[PDB]
Amino acid sequence: MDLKVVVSLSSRLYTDEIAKMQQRIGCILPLASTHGTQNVQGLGLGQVYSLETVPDYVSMYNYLSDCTLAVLDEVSVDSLILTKIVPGQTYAIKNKYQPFFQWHGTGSLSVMPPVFGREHATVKLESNDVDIVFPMVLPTPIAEEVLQKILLFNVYSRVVVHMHLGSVSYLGHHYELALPEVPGPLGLALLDNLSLYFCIMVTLLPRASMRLVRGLIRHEHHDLLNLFQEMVPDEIARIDLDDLSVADDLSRMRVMMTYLQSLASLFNLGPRLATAAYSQETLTATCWLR
Amino acid sequence: KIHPGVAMTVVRTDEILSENILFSSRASTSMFIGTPNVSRREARVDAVTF
Amino acid sequence: PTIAHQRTFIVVKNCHKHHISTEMELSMLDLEILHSIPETPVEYAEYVGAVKTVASALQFGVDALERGLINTVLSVKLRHAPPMFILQTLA
Amino acid sequence: RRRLQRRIAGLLPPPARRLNISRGSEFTRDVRGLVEEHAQASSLSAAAVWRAGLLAPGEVAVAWSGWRPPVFGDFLIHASSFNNAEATGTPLFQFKQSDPFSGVDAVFTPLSLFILMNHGRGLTRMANLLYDSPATLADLVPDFGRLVADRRFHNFITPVGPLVENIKSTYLNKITTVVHGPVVSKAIPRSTVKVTVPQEAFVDLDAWLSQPCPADARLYVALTYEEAGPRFTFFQSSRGHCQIMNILRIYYSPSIMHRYAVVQPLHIEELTFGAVACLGTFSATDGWRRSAFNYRGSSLPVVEIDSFYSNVSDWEVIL
């Protein structure tokens, strides 16, 4: 099967732009159309991530999850060649991303809009008058962390501690990601769905877990219990004054597991890539689309 | 239907479907022709798209 | 040259590549009945139509490339063509 | 070291992904070897079996191409529950029965599953014309109104892919469904099967929104519980599952207000508002060509998904 997309640049390409795009070989690029020959407009994430002050992340997640992906391998003057990522094939993807997030063995990579700034991943084509930005491919234990940091900065905006939430902290180095103030109507609808889910959580949550954790803060000193600072909250106590029953707790647990998967799919946005056999000396991972 | 203190100049644009004539002198462009290679892009469950 | 009452203009022109590609689509039925051998005349009469389909799809794909080469040549003649009202004064 | 060379000499050559042709009018041996696909059926003789390559291990080759064979499901059902004059490509819905060793299954067309939704309270002309007695369908499910009321109907129906082969048996019918894989027919002359979903149930979601053009537009089913009874709407969307759950909450946000307004969730199990599941992927350029399903005197409009790849998933709740 032939998966190869030649993107013919309508203009030429300068030598420094040749070097800057030749540095980004092996980096995943989204594609508007899945066909054999495309133009440079519609390539990359730079359409919805235009040269403006505010970033709109879920407007780019609406772009990333929809359109097809491609891995940049060969780029010369007047044309750059790509290799499509279709489901049902297996690809080798290299760790060629400027925030050096070390990939785990057989982990999961979730491609993402560039959270560490536009200019951290951008090739400016002055001759072709378009601006190609590159989506960041970071592992899902780090990707979920930076997405929840974005949404916690969203819900902590009217209250404001800032530099701790505004930066991701990795074992290699702590990195500072760019944060919007308004994602538009597409971003507030995400916290609308999340707030509806959290409200139905605080409806159907059981009480035996509260009866465990109240007496276990009052009994045992665990590292999972240090964040309370040895304080049992008042809603926990005034709920635990009511006597317990297992018959309602089974019906609460049977609607808790089904809802938690639906809450997990709320942060599962963006394309998911599954890896295999990643070695740090070759920096490549035999990785197929999930 | 009385006059305000101001006038206005109304600028509009007008598309026109022409029927052009292209001249091009003899031997003005050297070109190299490749080979028309068929491929296999995607095999669906009933049709493969060359 | 000069007129007595020395310049050399070294200029470089670079070629520009032009990729064109159309997509034909052939059903898997008239390939699996194309690979097999027919025994009865009503299956040979279908294998004939199945080789006509793949032949007129391949010939469609190589007709749409000598139709696309002329389109590319005409659309690259149409980009290095400044209009008459500029070249009647410039030339 | 030469025996290993002869072993690799059969293992080296990949499928021809490209082939530089000179003319299409010549139709060479090489482009014929490129376009030829090996068949899955032949006449029962040693020459036709050896030339079809049926005895080859793993795939078919006369003696890896992206083509995976489908896996079929075979269901012995009650012949009064199914109508034999239905279309060939129609999705079916197996009800996980409550009896431990029942040897007869319970499958449901979206017309067959519709008269479960109606009785207790277009399609309804055709769904009442196909099945003259809904009481023989209402006892396949042992407790339908109970299971709907506590919102546990979605995890009891599992979709089993579209029908391909249905032998008209008298008492205990047997049907063949592609439960996963390429939806292709099993017949002696092989022909294409198109997934027929009724038009008043099928609601498009790409046009309900009204420049990125993806390749595959996945098909979704949606069992959603309303006040008039549960519903089965079939969604066509080009976006992923993480997008389909958000846009399905956006699409069904008035109906959550309606279900919260007309009844009150006095129990904790009435909180769930339906669940959806992916039924499989089809091409986005030529999908969902409308057609008709002509029964004896009436015809309901039907939508016909061609080149379907059945891949069912577990239900994702909508809330």
Swiss-Prot record, chain A:
GO cellular component: host cell nucleus; viral capsid
Keywords carried by this UniProt record: Capsid protein, Host nucleus, Virion
InterPro entries: Herpes_capsid_2 (IPR002690)
Source organism superkingdom: Viruses
The keyword Oxidoreductase is assigned to this record: no
A Pfam family of this chain: Herpes_V23
Subcellular location: Virion; Host nucleus
Recorded GO MF terms: structural molecule activity
Major site of localization recorded for this protein: virion
Annotated signal peptide: none
Reported function: Structural component of the T=16 icosahedral capsid. The capsid is composed of pentamers and hexamers of major capsid protein/MCP, which are linked together by heterotrimers called triplexes. These triplexes are formed by a single molecule of triplex protein 1/TRX1 and two copies of triplex protein 2/TRX2. Additionally, TRX1 is required for efficient transport of TRX2 to the nucleus, which is the site of capsid assembly.
Record-stated family: Belongs to the herpesviridae TRX2 protein family.
Summary of subunit composition and partner proteins: Interacts with TRX1 and major capisd protein/MCP.
HAMAP family for the chain: HSV_TRX2
Record-given protein name: Triplex capsid protein 2
Annotated source species: Epstein-Barr virus (strain B95-8) (HHV-4)
Swiss-Prot record, chain C:
Protein name, per record: Major capsid protein
UniProt record similarity statement: Belongs to the herpesviridae major capsid protein family.
Subunit structure: Homomultimer. Makes the hexons and eleven out of twelve pentons. Interacts with triplex proteins 1/TRX1 and 2/TRX2; adjacent capsomers are linked together in groups of three by triplexes, heterotrimeric complexes composed of one molecule of TRX1 and two molecules of TRX2. Interacts with scaffold protein; this interaction allows efficient MCP transport to the host nucleus. Interacts with capsid vertex component 2/CVC2. Interacts with the small capsomere-interacting protein/SCP.
Subcellular localization(s) per the UniProt record: Virion; Host nucleus
Function (record text): Self-assembles to form an icosahedral capsid with a T=16 symmetry, about 200 nm in diameter, and consisting of 150 hexons and 12 pentons (total of 162 capsomers). Hexons form the edges and faces of the capsid and are each composed of six MCP molecules. In contrast, one penton is found at each of the 12 vertices. Eleven of the pentons are MCP pentamers, while the last vertex is occupied by the portal complex.
Residues represented out of the complete protein: 100 to 198 of 1381
Lineage, highest ranks first: Viruses, Duplodnaviria, Heunggongvirae, Peploviricota, Herviviricetes
From Swiss-Prot, chain D:
Gene Ontology MF annotations: DNA binding
Gene Ontology biological process terms from the UniProt entry: viral capsid assembly
GO cellular component: host cell nucleus; viral capsid
UniProt main location, coarse: virion
Protein keywords: Capsid protein, Host nucleus, Virion
Record has 4Fe-4S as a keyword: no
Family per record: Belongs to the herpesviridae TRX1 protein family.
Protein name per its UniProtKB record: Triplex capsid protein 1
Organism of origin: Epstein-Barr virus (strain B95-8)
This protein's encoding gene: TRX1
